[PDB]
Design a binder for this molecule. Structure first.
Ligand code: DOO
Length: 355
């Protein structure tokens, strides 16, 4: 918030490849999903509905509070227009892109917002408003939501066809990580509907893709920070997420799982026996054969460099570590035969490193 930056859309139209992946419009669809996901994470949306039409438009709808429409004092336009028609960025010092990138790279965009008993409607073309915000209908006060339909512009894309298969993979991936979410998908070209809703979240996922029944951390929290995790050892899946988006280069949340596991194995070796007390085991050793998914839900996810691929928040590391240690120790201290096996294989990895 120290520096706030506001431009028009020309830099996006001039270098589309710096604001999206231009093979197809999927990344644009991702921008819209991400916003609707932020409304799920804030506790207000439970439903994300996606439609692919035969005219090659894409519609995404949620049942959240609805994108605000109040007039900005300084900019003299509604929230929906302000967010759609200008590039928003900023930070702490100089030297995610926003839905305006989708508006910019689209010949047409329509927004329907339900709030405060009103159905609002607005239309853009090539990133400029062309039909004013207007109340077109009325509705129950608790009938709320945001719905965006957009028409990707062929001049900015190698192909206007949506890659359906990757879109489906992505939606499933997200529904897995948020049990309070139900995602629906309708492809009117292929005549195909899907519904993803995972009541037990990640349960069973590792099994499908020691302990024999993998360990699950189920919605652990400290204030406005949430942790879901599943892991086991094996002879491979190693996925981590922040706010439902992959962190292919790990970070503080992973280091958190790593340290929390080490601490748990080290303490258990110390408090038991197993002829392993004299083996110099490392965090790396107890992590070596670990298969897991960890998914954290935090307030202001800070990342590495200028990209969003490695979580940096220096206090997530001990948020995860402490939780993993406590939960895993409890489990170790009620599963004797398997603890012993986990410990032994870990010692084996350590001895092979030392030799
Ligand atoms: C496909 N659906 C969809 C699509 C979409 F592009 C945006 C929203 C969207 N649904 C939304 N719901 C809310 O809800 C809010 C209401 N009030 C406040 C203060 N914040 C969020 N806000 C929304 N906003 C406001 C901004 C805050 C974070 N992201 C921006 C987009 C959306």
């Amino acid at each position: 918030k120290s520096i706030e930056v506001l431009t028009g859309l020309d830099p996006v139209k001039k270098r589309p490849g710096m604001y999206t992946n231009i093979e197809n419009p999927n990344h644009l669809i991702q921008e819209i999903i991400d916003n609707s996901v932020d409304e799920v994470l804030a506790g207000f949306a439970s439903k994300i509905n996606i439609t692919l039409y035969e005219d090659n438009s894409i519609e995404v709808a949620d049942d959240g509070r609805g994108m605000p429409v109040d007039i900005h004092p300084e900019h003299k336009m509604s929230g929906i227009e302000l967010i759609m028609t200008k590039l928003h960025s900023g930070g702490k010092f100089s030297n995610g892109v926003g839905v305006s990138v989708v508006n910019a790279l689209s010949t047409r965009l329509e927004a329907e917002i339900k709030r405060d008993g009103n159905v609002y409607h607005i239309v853009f073309e090539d990133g400029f408003k062309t039909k004013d915000l207007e109340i077109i209908d009325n509705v129950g006060k608790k009938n709320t939501g945001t719905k965006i339909r957009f028409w990707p512009n062929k001049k900015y894309f190698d192909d206007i066809k949506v890659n359906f298969k990757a879109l489906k993979n992505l939606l499933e991936a997200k529904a897995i990580l948020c049990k309070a979410l139900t995602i629906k998908y309708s492809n009117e070209i292929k005549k195909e509907k899907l519904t993803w809703h995972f009541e037990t979240g990640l349960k069973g996922y590792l099994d499908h893709k020691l302990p024999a029944e993998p360990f699950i951390i189920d919605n652990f929290s400290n204030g406005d920070s949430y942790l879901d995790a599943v892991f086991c050892w094996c002879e491979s899946i190693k996925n981590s997420y922040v706010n439902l988006i992959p962190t292919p280069q790990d970070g503080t949340h992973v280091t958190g799982l790593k340290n929390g596991i080490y601490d748990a194995i080290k303490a258990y070796i110390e408090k038991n026996s197993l002829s392993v007390k004299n083996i110099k085991i490392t965090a790396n050793d107890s992590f070596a054969q670990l298969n897991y998914v960890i998914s954290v839900k935090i307030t202001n996810p800070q990342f590495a460099g200028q990209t969003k691929e490695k979580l940096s928040n220096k206090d997530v590391t001990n948020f995860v570590a402490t939780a993993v240690k406590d939960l895993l120790t409890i489990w170790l201290n009620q599963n004797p035969d398997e603890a012993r096996q986990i410990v032994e294989n870990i010692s084996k990895v350590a001895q092979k490193r030392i030799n």
